[PDB]
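Inputs:
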Amino acid sequence: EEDASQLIFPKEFETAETLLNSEVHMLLEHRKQQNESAEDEQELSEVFMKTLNYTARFSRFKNRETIASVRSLLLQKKLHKFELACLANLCPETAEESKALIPSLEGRFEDEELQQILDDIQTKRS
Amino acid sequence: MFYHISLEHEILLHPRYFGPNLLNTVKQKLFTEVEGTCTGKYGFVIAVTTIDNIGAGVIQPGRGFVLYPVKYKAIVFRPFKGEVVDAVVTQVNKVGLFTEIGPMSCFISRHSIPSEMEFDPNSNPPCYKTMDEDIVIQQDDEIRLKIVGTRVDKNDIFAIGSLMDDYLGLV
Amino acid sequence: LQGKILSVDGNKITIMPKHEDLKDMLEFPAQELRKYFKMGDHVKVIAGRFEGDTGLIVRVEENFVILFSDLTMHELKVLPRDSGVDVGGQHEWGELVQLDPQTVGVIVRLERETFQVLNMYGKVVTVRHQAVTRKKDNRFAVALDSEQNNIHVKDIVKVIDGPHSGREGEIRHLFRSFAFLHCKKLVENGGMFVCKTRHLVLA
Amino acid sequence: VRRGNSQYPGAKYIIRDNGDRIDLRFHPKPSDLHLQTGYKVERHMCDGDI
Amino acid sequence: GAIFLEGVTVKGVTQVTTQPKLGEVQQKCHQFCGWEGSGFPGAQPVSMDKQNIKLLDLKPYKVSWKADGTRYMMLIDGTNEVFMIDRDNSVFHVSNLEFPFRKDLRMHLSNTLLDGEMIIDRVNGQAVPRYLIYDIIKFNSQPVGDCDFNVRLQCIEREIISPRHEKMKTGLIDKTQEPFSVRNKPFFDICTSRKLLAKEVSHEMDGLIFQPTGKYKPGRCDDILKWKPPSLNSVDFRLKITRMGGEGLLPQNVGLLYVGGYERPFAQIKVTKELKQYDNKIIECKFENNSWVFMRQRTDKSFPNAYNTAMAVCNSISNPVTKEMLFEFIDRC
RNA sequence: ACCGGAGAGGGAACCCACU
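Outputs:
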C-alpha cells in the first residue's frame, strides 16, 4: 500500500520533516565538528562516514542561506511536503523530466509554472 | 529518503554511571546505541541531531538499573517501493552491477538491465556499454536508479532496484 | 480477479477470497486458482530443488516466475505453484568437479561459456564448461569432526574454527580433508562454502 | 573464594558479568579464581546474616 | 602436516608414508632413547623461571643459543638410510647426505642417532638450509647418550663432522651436491654468555639454552632450560575481538585472550584497529607489564595452546630468569 | 584439551507418624 506515486505514507511516519542532501551534509558536518572537539568520545560509524561522503559528492549547493531560500520559495507554492526535497535533490532540467521522475506532479501544475520552478532551482544551483 | 523524525527509546543505566554527570552518560548511551543502527520499520538511523526530552527514570524493583524514556530528534533513511534516487557504482559483475546508496547497498540485475547495456569483460575495467558505444557504465560512476524492493537482513536493510524506466541511467 | 485467502478446504477450497475492491467473499475451487504475485513482494519456495529459499520476484512470465534469492543474488526461475542445469545438460549447479589432477571444486554459478567454481581451498575460479570434469560424488563418505564424531553427507555441523567460525551448514560433499557445506542464509556463492573437517562439530 | 566451599567460612559459586557460573567445590582452575568488581559471589551464611 | 622445512624447499628430502618402512624408523628411535610412551622420544627443555635459574648454581652447565629452528632427530642407519624425525613423529628420508666412518672412509655410519635443529640461515643474501647437531644419542649402537655431555659434544666433532670434512677435502664429497649444510651447535660455558647480554648481538638472539653436563635423558627435562626475553618473551592466544557491553553498561569493545581447553577469556588486551586485522586468529603476545601485547600472528597454528601451558608461561614470566641471574647460580658450583 | 566435573534421581496411590 506504501507507494510514493500515490502518496501513501505510514501514519507514524506521516508528520516527519523531509531533508535535502545539502542540509543533511551541514548537519552531519556540524556533528563531525562536535565529535572531533570534546575528546574521549566514540569514533563515528562507518554508516556516518558513508552518508557524509555520499552527501558531500551529492551536495547541490553549498550555501546555507540558499537552502532556506529554495525551501521557502518552493513551499510558498502549494505542494505536498514529500515532493520538496525529492525535487530539489533530483533537480530536473525540464518539466517533462520532472513529471517522469515524480508522477505525482503530472497534472498537479501546468507546464509553464513547473518549468519556472525548475529554472529557479537551477538558478540557485551553485 | 532522508527525514527528520522524533523517536522514543528507553535506556537502562548501570548504577556506576550515576556519578555527578548522569545526563551526559545518558546522552552518550543513547548515541552509542542508536547511532548507525537499522530498523526495518523506520530504516537507517544516520544521526541524532538533538534529544527532545529525557523523562523521569524509574528504578527497577530488585535491579539496580534505571530506565529513562528519552525523546530525541534523529535523521532517518528508509527507501520506498517507487522512489528514484541517484546511486554510485561499487562493483561490475557478470551477475549484475553493485551500486552504493548512502549506507545501503543494492544491485541491478542483468534482466532488469536494459538489453542495450551489453557486457564488456575484455575492457580493462569491466564495463556496461551499448552497441553504439555511447553510454559507458563503469566502476565509481554515479547513476540514476529505481529501487523496487527492499529486504531486511540481521535488522539491516538491503534493497534491489530496476533500471528499465526511461531517463534512468548515467548522470 | 486477485484477492487474499480467507479460508481453505482440501479440494474445492471454497477459497473465500477478498478480491481487490470487493467486500464480498466468493468461492473457488482449487483448480480455478493460482498463486499470483506482483513484482517486488517477498516469496518463499514451498517445494522443489530450491525449497526453503526466499527472494523478491523481479519478473513474472506466462506461468514462469523469476526471482533473486536473498542469500545470494543468483537467479531463480520457478513455477507459479511453487531448471537448475546448465545449457548442454552435462553439469548442474552444486555439482562436484575436478579442476586439475589435484584440485576439486563445486560449481556455484552458471554462465553461458563458463562456470564459477568454489575450489577446495575456498577460492572461486572461472573455468570453461569443458575445462572441468564431472566427478563421481561419494554420498557414503565418512569423516571425523573436531570432537572425533563420525560425520556424513547431509549432517548439520557448526563451524568452530577457521574463517567460517560461527557459521552452521549442511554437509554436501566430502573429499580428503575438505567439506563443502551449504547454508541458505549465506548469499555468497549460492550458499556454498568449504571448511576443514577438524573445524566442524556435529550440531 | 580462595578458602572455597570445603572450609565453612567460604563461597559456593562465583557469578561473572556474562552470567557464567563457576563452581568452587570441584577443582576450580586457578585462573578463574580471580575476580573483578562486577562479579557476584555466593558466600555461605555467616554471622549477622538476616 | 609434513612440510620439512618451511620457507625454503630442500631437494632430496622426502617425507615417508609407507607403513612397512615408516613404522620401523619411528621404532628404532624409541629403542635408542629408552623411551616410554608413543611419539617424540627426544629431550624436551623447560622454560626458565625464578625457580629454575637456581640449578645454574647447583651443577655445571653449558650454554648455547636458541635459533628459531625446527626440531629434528637425524637417524643415520646406513648408506642411503638417513631420516629426520620431528616433534610430531613425522619422518623424512634425506638423500645425498653421507656419513663416513672416522676409521674406514669407504665405510658408512650405521645405527647412529643425532639430535638437532634444522635452521634456515641466509648468508650472501641467500637462504642456506643447515642442520645443527646439538646432541648425539647413539653411535654405532654404542650407548653414548650415557656419556658426559662434554664427551658427546666431542664425539660429534670427531665421529661425525671431522670424517665428512675429511672426505670433502678429497673431492669424494661435494659440499655442493648435498641437500643441506651439517654442523655442530657451538656451546660455551656460563661466563661467556654474560657477554651476550656491550651486546651488539642484542637483536639476533631469540634466546639461550642451558645444557647440563649429565647423561642424555628423553622426554621432559626440568634441568634443561630455555631462556627467552619476556618482551618476546609468549603464548598462542586465540583472540575474539568482542563488543562486550553489559546490560545497563556503555557498550565497549575488548579483545578476549582465549587459551586451549578453557572456555572463558583467560585475559584481556587493549584492543585496537591496528590489531583488528587478525580477527579470530591465533597470535603470540608479550607480557612485559600487566598487559599482554601483540608481536606476531601465527597463521600456521590453528589452536591456542593449553591452559597448563598458559599457567607455566605466566609463572615463568612472573619470575624473570636472567642470564646474570643463573650465571652466578652455577658459578657457585 | 584425552570425554566437556556428566549431578535433575519417574509419577501416582495408600499407610504410619511429627508439630
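Remarks. Helices of chain B lie at 22-34. Chain B has two domains: 1-80, 81-171.
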